C-alpha cells in the first residue's frame, strides 16, 4: 500500500552537511535519513567554484565523506578529487603526446595518498623525453610531500601551483600546454 510508504517518507528527517576545517565550513547540501547512523558513510560530490566561486575552476570535482554527526548537523572529511571527463577529452588530441605519472606519497603528518599527474606536449615526441618528464614530476611531488602536509598539499594541488612548477621545469625538455594534477586518492590515516 501507500500508507506505509508515506509513513516511511514522513519519518525521515533532514540533516545539513558541512565541509571540513582547512576548507571553509560550508553548507554543501541536505540529506534525508530515519536514523543518525545510516548517514555515517556518504559521499557528497561538489565542485571547487561552488565553495570559492572562481569562475574558471569549475572542472574540478571534490568528494567529501561523512564521518560524524551532532544533532542535525553532519561534518565531512576529504577523500579525493579528480578532473572532469570533458576537460580531459578536449585536452588529449591527435598529433600530440600525453605523459601520465602515478605515485604513492606520505606527507609530513603520516597521511598516505595516491597522486596522478598529467602532462601534454605540442608534438609527437620520443619516449626518452617522456621518461625525463616523468622523472621531473616524480621529484617535484616527492619534494612537496616531504615539505608540506595534507591541507596545503591539497589546496596547492587544486589551485594550480604544483602544476605551474611542473610545467616550468619540464619546459626544459620540450614545451608544454596544460600541465595539471589530475587525481588524488586518500588511502590511509595514522
Amino acid at each position: 500500500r501507500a500508507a506505509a510508504a508515506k509513513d516511511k517518507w514522513k519519518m525521515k528527517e533532514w540533516y545539513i552537511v558541512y565541509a571540513p576545517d582547512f576548507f571553509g565550513s560550508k553548507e554543501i547540501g541536505l540529506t534525508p535519513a530515519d536514523d543518525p547512523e545510516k548517514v555515517i558513510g556518504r559521499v557528497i560530490e561538489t565542485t571547487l567554484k561552488d565553495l570559492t566561486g572562481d569562475f574558471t575552476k569549475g572542472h574540478v570535482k571534490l568528494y567529501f565523506q561523512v564521518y560524524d554527526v551532532k544533532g542535525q548537523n553532519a561534518y565531512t572529511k576529504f577523500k579525493g578529487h579528480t578532473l572532469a571527463r570533458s576537460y580531459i577529452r578536449s585536452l588529449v588530441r591527435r598529433r600530440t603526446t600525453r605523459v601520465d605519472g602515478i605515485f604513492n606519497i606520505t606527507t609530513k603528518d603520516g597521511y598516505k595518498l595516491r597522486v596522478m599527474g598529467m602532462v601534454i606536449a605540442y608534438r609527437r615526441i620520443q619516449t626518452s623525453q617522456e621518461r625525463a618528464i616523468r622523472k621531473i614530476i616524480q621529484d617535484i611531488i616527492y619534494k612537496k610531500a616531504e615539505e608540506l602536509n595534507f591541507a596545503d598539499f591539497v589546496l596547492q594541488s587544486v589551485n594550480g601551483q604544483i602544476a605551474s612548477e611542473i610545467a616550468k621545469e619540464a619546459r626544459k625538455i620540450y614545451p608544454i600546454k596544460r600541465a595539471e594534477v589530475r587525481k588524488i586518492k586518500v588511502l590511509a590515516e595514522p
Partner: protein
C-alpha cells in the same frame, strides 16, 4: 529552503530508466521506466515514453519537496554499446519543463581501459 537532487538516466536501445535520488545517491525518491507507461515492448525507448516517465518522476519529486536537480546520463557501457539511446534528451527536456531547476550535466558511461571480450563470436551477428 531549496533542495537539490540527482537524476540518473540509464538509456539503451531497448528501454530508458529515470531515477531521482538525493545528492548522496543513498536515499531514493522516485523511479520510473518506459515499461510502466506503455504496453508494446517496441516502444519502451520512444522519446515520448521517456517524456512521460520523466514527468511522473519529476512531479513525485516535487511533491516530496525537491526543487533543483543535477543530471548524470548513462549508457550500459563496458563491453556493450557506448552510445546512449534517443530517450535521454527527451527525458532531460521533460524534466526541465516539469518545473525543476537544472544544474550540472555529465555523462557517466563506464569505459574499459582494456577489458573483457564481447559477445559477437569473432564474426559478430549475421542476422
Amino acid at each position: 529552503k531549496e533542495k537539490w537532487g540527482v537524476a540518473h538516466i540509464y538509456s539503451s536501445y531497448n528501454n530508458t530508466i529515470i531515477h531521482i535520488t538525493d545528492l548522496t545517491g543513498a536515499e531514493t525518491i522516485s523511479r520510473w521506466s518506459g515499461g510502466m507507461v506503455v504496453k508494446a515492448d517496441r516502444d519502451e525507448p520512444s522519446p515520448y515514453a521517456a517524456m512521460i516517465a520523466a514527468r511522473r518522476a519529476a512531479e513525485e519529486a516535487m511533491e516530496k519537496g525537491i526543487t533543483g536537480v543535477h543530471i548524470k546520463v548513462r549508457a550500459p557501457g563496458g563491453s556493450k554499446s557506448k552510445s546512449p539511446g534517443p530517450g535521454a534528451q527527451a527525458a532531460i527536456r521533460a524534466l526541465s519543463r516539469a518545473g525543476l531547476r537544472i544544474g550540472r550535466v555529465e555523462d557517466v558511461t563506464p569505459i574499459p581501459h582494456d577489458g573483457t571480450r564481447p559477445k559477437g563470436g569473432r564474426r559478430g551477428r549475421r542476422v
